[PDB]
Structures are given as C-alpha cells and as structure tokens.
Design a protein around this ligand. Structure first.
Ligand code: ASP
Ligand code: ASP
Ligand code: ASP
Ligand code: NA
Ligand code: NA
Ligand code: NA
Ligand code: NA
Ligand code: NA
Ligand code: NA
Lengths: 404, 411, 400
C-alpha cells in the first residue's frame, strides 16, 4: 500500500487538496459527478465511526464508571475530582457563550419531534430491556444503565466472597478491552481518514459554494478563541489565587502541551505529562495518581468542543435551542467528556452521544451531512482540544499539591 | 440522605402510611391529584424492576443450568434433587387449590385507563411448541419474549458444563471464564435489586397509594384475600408435606421445628435465603447431620428448591387472570406448574427476586408486561409483595433442612 | 434412554427406512398425518440450525480472525477471497451453459445499483445488526474486530494485554459451546431427518414431471460437472490428490448433503480439515468464512432457475441481462446464509434485478414450482458449496 505517511500531515493534505478540487468543481464540471463518484467514499468513512459508537459508548462508560465510584478513593482525589468536575462544568458554559457571540450554522441552513410532559423522558432515561435499548440506537438510557452497572461492579469487588470478587474483575475486564479493541479500529479508521475526509469536504465544497468556508472558519474561531479564554480566564486565574507563578508554569509545560497538540492523544502523551510534573516540584504519590486519572477523565477541551458543535448543528438546521434543553448540553457534554477516550477521533464520536440527547438522531439525513462537516474539519479542532485537555491535568495537579 | 433505616420496617411504614393517605384522598381531594403527582414515582420503581428482568432471567438461568447438569453430581445429590423436584412440584399444585377455594381477583375486574385487556388465542400447538425454540438468540434476548430465552439459556448452561470435562485445556479454560462472565453479570444485577429495594419505600408508597385512591376499599378486601390464600397454603404445605414426610422416615417433627427455630425466623425477617445460609448451616449441626451431607445440600438448597415462591407465583397468576376476568384453561393451567417450578429454580433468594420471576411465569401463557392492564394488576402484587415475601422465605429455608434431615436418614 | 447408536448409521437407518415407511404409508394411508404429527418433528430439527448460525458465525470468525494475527497479517485471506470470487464467477458461467444445453421453460410458456450495497457491507450498529438477521456486516465487523484484539495482545501494557485474552476467551467457548450443541442436534437428526424426508417422499420427486426434471437434469449433471471441470482441475495443478481428497471429505459432504445446512455441517468440515493435515489457524478461518460466502452450488442453481423462469415465460434473455445474471447470481450466493430455505428466496433479487418482480403473478407463481422442487434440489446444492471451500483451503494452504 506504501501509505506510511504521518497521519496528521497525510490528512492535512487531503483537507487542503480536497478543498480546492471541490471549488474547481464548484464551477466547471458540475454537481452530479461528485455526488456519485467521490461522496460514496465519504459515507464509508463516516459509517465506520457510526459503527463504533454504540459499543464504545456502552463499554467506555462502564469502564469509566468503575474507575470513579465514590468512595473508592482517598481524599487526595476528592479535591481534584471536584476540581475536575468544575473545570469541565464551566468549560462548556463558556462554549455556549462562544456559540452565542459567534453564531455558526445560522445562515448555512440546508425536522424533529416535540417533548412529552417531562414525566415520560425523565422516566425514559431508564431502559425497559437493557439489550433492546443497547440493540437499536437509543443512546440516552444506554448511558444511565451502563453507569448503574459500572458502579454495581465496584461493589462486587469489595464483597467478602472470593468467587464474587473474581466474578467482578473478569466481567469488568471483558468490557474493558472490548473498550480498548474499539480504539485500534478507530485508529484503523484514521488510516482511512485521509481518503475519507477528502471525499467529504470535497462534496461540501462543490455544493453550498464558499459560504461553508466562511462558516467553517466561524466555528474554528468560536472554538479556538474560547479555548485560549479558558486558559486565561480559568487556568491563569485559579493559578494566581494559590500562589503559583502562571507564566513559568507554561514554560515547564511547554513540551507537555505541544507534544499533545501534534499527537492529539492524551492517553499517548501521558509519559510526557508525567515527566513535566517532576520538573516543577510535584510530589510522587500525587502525580502518579492525578495524571493517570486526568488522562481519561476531565476533557474540558472536548466538553467545550461539543457544546459549540451542537449549536452549529442546531443553527445549521435553523432550530432554536431552548433552555431546559440548553442546560441538558452542559449536563451531557461533561458526561460525554468523561467518557471520551483521549485519541484522534474520540471526541467527534462522543458528540453523537450529546446529539441523541436533546432529540437529534443520526439516522436522520440532515444530521448526517451537518455532522460530516464538523467531522471533516474535526482534525483541526482536535489538536488544540488535546492541548487544553492536557493543560487541565497539570494545572489541577499543581493546585492539589499546594493544599496537601 | 440520612435514610439509613432497616429496609423491612422502613418499607412497612410506607405501606401502612401509604394506605391511609390513599383512603383519605379516596374521598376529599379527588382522583386526579394522585394520578399525576404520586404515581409517576411508582412507575419508576416498577420500571426499575422491569429493567432487570431480561438480563437476570438470562444470566440466572445459565448459572442455574450449569449448577445442576446431570450427571455432574454424586448419587448423594440424586436423592435430594428428586426430593427438591417433587417438593417444589406439588407446592404450586397446592397453590392452584388455594387459588381455587379462594378466588382472588375475581370481583376486582378492571380496565384502568380505558383499555379492557383482550389477550390473543393459541396456534394449533405446533407453532408454540416450536416457538419455544428461538430463531436468533440475540433478537429473542433483545426485545422481550421470555419463553425461548429460557429454553436456549438452559441449553447453553448445559453445553458449558460439557466444555469443562473436554480434554483440551484451553477449551476447559474457555468454559470457566465465559461462565463466570455470565456469573457476576448474574450477581451484579442483585446489587441493583438491593439498590432498588432502597427506593422501595418511596416506590411502594406511591403505588398502593394510587390503588387506595381508585378502586376504593374493595382492593383491601381482595389484597387480604390473596394474603390469606397464600399464608394458609404455606402452613398447609408445612403440615401436609413436611410434617407428613418427616413422620414416614422416623424423624420427630415437633422438635425439628425447635431446632430450626432460629433458621426460620431469621429467614422470615431478612427475606434473604442466600443471606440466611450460615444460620441454616449452624442449625444443621445442632440436630445430628453429617458434614459431607449438609455442606452439599444447603448450598444447593440456597438457590434451588424455592417451594415458598413456586406456590407464591402459582397464586399470584390466578390473581392477575381473575383480576382481568379471564378464565384459565387446563393445558395452560398445567403450564403454570411447569413454569413456576423453573421460575422457582431460577429465583435468587433475595428481597425482590420472586416478584420479578413472576413476570417470567406471566409472559408464558400469553400475558406480556408491555400491556397496560398487566402493569397495574402486577403493581398491586408488587406493593404487598414485601409481606408475602417474608413467609415465603421462611418456607424456602424449611424445605432445605427437612430434605437435609431426610436424605441423611437413607445414607 | 437406550438411544446411543453411532449417527453414521442411526440416521442411515432413519433415511433408508425414511424411504420405506414414507412411500408405503405414502400410498393409501389417508389422514395426511405426515404434515401434522411427523413434520412437527422435522421442522423442530431445522429450527435448531437456524438458532445456531448467527452466534457460531460471529463467535468463530472473531476467533479465526484472532489467530491469523500476522500469519500473513491477514493477507492469507486476500488470496482465498479471490479464490472465492472466481469459483463462484465461473460456477454461474457453467450454469449459463447448463441452461443453454438444457431448456427447462418453453413448450409451457405463457402470460399467466451497486453503491449502497457495498456500503451496506458495513454495519450501522453491531448489536442492532447482530440482533435481528443481517449477515454480511456481522462478518465484516467480527473480522475487523478479530484483527484489532490481537494488537491488544502484544501491546506493552500488562492489564490491557490481559483485557484481550479474557474477552477473547469469552468469545471462544461461546464459540465451542455452540458447536457441541450442533451435535446434540445431530443426535436428534435421525428423528429429525426421518420426519422431514417423510414429507419429501409422499409428494415431491415424481412431480410435474419433465419441465421440472428438465431443471433437475441441468442441475445434477452440472453440479457434478462443476467438480470435474473445476475442482479436480485445480486439485491437480496444485499437487493435491483428487482421489483421497474426496475420501478425506467422505463424511463431511455426505452429512452436508442430507442436512442441507452449511453452518450445521461446519463442525464436521473442520473435523475433516484436521484429517487432511491442515493447520488450525488457516482452517479455523477460511472454512467459517467460506461457510457463508462462496456458495457456488447456489450461484449455479440460481442462474438455471432464472433462465427456467425466463424460458417458461416466452420472453428470452439478451446477452445484456445474461451478463448481469452472471453478475447478480454471485452476489446472491454472497448474501445467502447457508440454511435450507434461503436458496430459492435469495434467488429473488437475481430476478428483481434484470427485472422480473414477484408482483406480476406469472412470476410469484412459476417461481413457486422451482420453490416446490427446491426441497430435493437443496440437498445437491449444499454439498457443492462446502467442497468448493475445503478445496480452496487446501490449495491456499499449499502456498504457505
Ligand atoms: N484526541 C483528544 C480527545 C478527543 O478527541 O476528544 C485527546 O487525546 O485529548
Ligand atoms: N427473597 C426470597 C426469594 C423470593 O423472593 O422469591 C428468599 O430469600 O427466600
Ligand atoms: N442450505 C444451503 C443453502 C441454500 O441453498 O439455501 C447450504 O447450507 O449450503
Ligand atoms: Na474521558
Ligand atoms: Na484529559
Ligand atoms: Na433459585
Ligand atoms: Na431455598
Ligand atoms: Na459455502
Ligand atoms: Na453467502
């Protein structure tokens, strides 16, 4: 196959090259040649992610749910979990604002059902038959239940019976790996990403004209200017109130951010994140505990990412978001960020989750396309997103080591 | 949350307190305030049990099926398994009689929200005897459809045991791990059932509250008509089965109860046959039972042989049937006994267990829980379940010790 | 229970004596009891086969997909993949000639794209798919799943390495358990088969007579003809003994022929794969894959049927649809499960394409006479699909 190139560039080629080929066929050779000979390669890519969604959702959430479970942790974690909870919680609230002062999707307009009298949906979050729910789509209850199980398991491990203790581990580990196996396919999909994305954005550059680019960069801005604002108004702020020098903090994390920015793998940048921790005076039994938990949990760069991407979709349909469903985003996107893997694609797919909630199924055509536009450019947003995901751990690690 | 109270009382408060509040709103503040502000809390409770049904059914039956499998047992068990089979088998037959001389449900006939239940007919025997066999295990296990889920799950539970005796080591290993995955999956469920029983006080309160506001007091006259049919069947089991088979083997039946005094009464209160086991083992030594005998029967009697439940279901069914006004046919009546036993063998030995296994003995015979009229009628049993549960457990434990004292006579 | 006998013979009792009591009480007899108190024991059997297929295919083709872990990455398959294509894409070519030399149709003639489907090889959600039917993707996923897991095997992390095996081993046994059920089914088969081929001996066979046996001709002297001018053809050119080849398979095919199930006679297929010196990994992969895709016996059959239907109408085939048949007919044997009924059914879209809908009565009728004799025809067809896999398995094993 001879296709050995470094993924990031290898894809950033198919993005810029795919744009132009789309525009040169925006005029000239018209719109029916692409909608038949290029996009069929796009859908494939997307549907390979679709594929992954339900199992990853399920498995990831259980593995996540068994990793947190209170109280299966020392109070050394309590300070940082609360930190993780609130650094992620406010992150998406900021994402709302970036989706408020910037309105991406509104003007790109290219139909959903009502809500029952609150009773049913608050009940509907509870599955009827776990299998049947997990079977065909329906994400919302899949969450609820999966968690309830992930918790149950941890309490089988502390049960006095040895076989019961044994039953817990094995089962959990079966879901784990099932978890992990998924990701090697996600990476197996990211090898198809260059040929995949090329076809996608190519279709979106042929139809809809150039108005897309004026909105794509309007998303990308709303995101990146929210990202740095997070660092400046949250990190830089909470660094000052605890006596830590915020300028030299960045100089010590210089390698930890920039290696994470390029690789886009928070779970892969961890030894680099651990190496930086020692270089600025953080205790052993402190950073060997927080960083391995920050590698999976606390994904504020993603939590925000989804909170915006949603508004995009909403406005790209021309649907106005209500409060009650707006405060659902923040409730979901967090649970979504806590679920996310810490790998190239991860976030994008977890977005699907924060979409099936609020009444936006991916089986619907208008969702497919609009989502695929985010998915095409995902790679760009992904880089900065990761960079912030890693900063959130070290800042918390430097903060929790102050009051200990 | 500060809600630390002992479950039994903590719930028996919400039952008696919930009754009165229902009746005082039976008149006065009328029927539309409850059907909107209290019952939405009830359904939640119920649906948390619904949730559990399919997986527990599946997992429990496989774990059960791999625990019995003949011949994966010494002849020391053959005498007691046959005993377990026939003590449970006749128990529900008695339950039929208690549902015959007492007719609970007949005269309570309801249509709830305007939906008179009209279940469907039976095909010419061929299809259903075939339909017990799944088309695609997954698809069956997926959306409801309990009947074939049973059949298949068992067939698997048996298969597994025969992978363990296979000469290949990796195959032997494959068997254990897989089975253990289903196990735990089995067990994990139960910690959620107990997690549901912590919601039971707030749950049940809302349920019986709705049933005391609508239908009037005629419910109580029938609820206690069930409870009677049950309890007077329960003691009759002990007196006409246990006390009878105790006499034919030379065992003194009066002092037997004096030695099992702690074993019954601790089981009566806790309602956990799987939790009362060390107490059941301690009593066994106190009346002269051999070691390699009670260390084998009691751990098997803790899960299998649930005659107090087998009967419980055999009645509860008639309740539902008559509560709809549907007359039960023989052919389907002898299905009850066939099912309720397999249901009792599946049941866990924990606070809720039985009630949920009832759902199983309902999907069989043509009574799905997706149907509205079933929901409500079942929820009435589920509300009072806690009461029946206590005596049920007490009998479930007596059935093991009596068998243990009997099988140690001819050995 | 007394019933312990070897099945080699036990069903050969219930088949030979399945023909005696069948015909004797097939004449006179009355009450047509076979279709009321006998068949309910025939179908029961079949139904258990329909039960296994999904699980086993899944369980197996993750397990087999987890052993070839760079035995050639997985590009051992690439070779057999294409073996499958041309065993099929030449089997149908033979059927076109079979239907050129035999004309079942005229004499009783009367008036009473590619896109989505290839994407559809990729599933939406495993569970949803896996749950209710849906074959191809179920494979696809499992294969790809199988692959991924092995990369977890050698991954530097200890518990993650551990995550794989435990999980996989769970998928195994879930495999092996299923297998040992196929053989609780075959110990029932004497009772099963007897009951069914009692219905097959009361009607069928002597019906309706020539035009149908005109197909049955183009069938059996084409099936057997496949073997000789294809299988034995490449057996020689790959140094594999044609004589013993069949004799190593002696029981595999002769069970498959009777059982008519691909996935019910896969246990024996592999038990025969061991008998002729085949490596576990290779066979534990190819066979289960071929045990669904490459059903050449069907690929041929469907064509002849199509032609029969066409010639039975009085409307004739241009080499503008002729080519598209050799095209679609394969894609049908691609999607066919491997269980008794599906042959005639899948045959539908090789007719819907080309353009012959079962909504014109002439169709959903003439068809229903091929559908009549299918019961007989299904037996011969089955046997072929399986051989034409073992064949390729050995051939590709030769180049290793
Ligand atoms: N790839 C990101 C996670 C994401 O895509 O959401 C990371 O490693 O931090
Ligand atoms: N809880 C009962 C079982 C049941 O509810 O059926 C017991 O432990 O014996
Ligand atoms: N049952 C056949 C396929 C068919 O003709 O339907 C086989 O397994 O080979
Ligand atoms: Na995460
Ligand atoms: Na992180
Ligand atoms: Na039981
Ligand atoms: Na018991
Ligand atoms: Na085949
Ligand atoms: Na096929």
């Amino acid at each position: 196959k001879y296709i050995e190139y470094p993924v990031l560039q290898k894809i950033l080629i198919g993005l810029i090259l795919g744009a132009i080929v789309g525009l040169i066929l925006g005029h000239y050779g018209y719109a029916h040649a692409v909608h038949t000979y290029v996009k069929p390669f796009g859908d494939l890519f997307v549907r390979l992610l679709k594929m992954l969604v339900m199992p990853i959702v399920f498995a990831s959430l259980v593995v996540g749910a068994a990793s947190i479970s209170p109280a299966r942790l020392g109070r050394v974690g309590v300070k940082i979990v609360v930190y993780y909870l609130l650094t992620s919680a406010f992150a998406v609230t900021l994402g709302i604002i970036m989706a408020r002062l910037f309105n991406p999707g509104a003007g790109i307009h290219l139909q959903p059902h009502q809500a029952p009298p609150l009773v049913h949906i608050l009940l509907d979050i509870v599955p009827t038959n776990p299998f049947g729910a997990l079977a065909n789509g329906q994400v919302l209850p899949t969450i609820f239940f999966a968690i309830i199980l992930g918790i149950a398991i941890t309490y089988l491990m502390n049960s006095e019976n040895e076989k019961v203790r044994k039953s817990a581990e094995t089962l959990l580990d079966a879901i784990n790996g099932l978890a992990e196996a998924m990701y090697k396919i996600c990476n197996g999909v990211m090898q198809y990403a260059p040929i995949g994305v090329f076809a996608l954005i190519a279709y979106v550059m042929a139809e809809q004209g150039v108005h897309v680019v004026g909105e794509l960069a309007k998303v990308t801005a709303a995101v990146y200017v929210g990202l740095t604002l997070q660092i400046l108004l949250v990190y830089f702020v909470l660094l000052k109130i605890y006596g830590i020098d915020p300028i030299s903090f960045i100089k010590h994390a210089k390698d930890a951010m920039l290696t994470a920015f390029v690789t886009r793998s928070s779970s892969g940048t961890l030894p680099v994140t651990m190496r930086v921790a020692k270089e600025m005076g953080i205790s052993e039994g402190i950073y060997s505990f927080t960083l391995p938990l920050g590698a999976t949990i606390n994904m504020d760069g993603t939590a925000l990412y989804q909170g915006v991407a949603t508004f995009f979709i909403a406005n790209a349909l021309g649907s106005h978001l209500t409060v009650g469903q707006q405060l659902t985003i923040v409730l979901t996107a967090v649970l979504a960020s806590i679920g996310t893997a810490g790998v190239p694609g991860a976030g994008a797919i977890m977005l699907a989750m924060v979409l099936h909630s609020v009444g936006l199924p991916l089986t619907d055509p208008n969702v497919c396309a609009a989502y695929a536009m985010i998915l095409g450019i995902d790679a760009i947003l992904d880089m900065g997103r990761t960079m912030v995901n890693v900063t959130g751990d070290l800042t918390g690690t430097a903060i929790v080591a102050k009051t200990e």
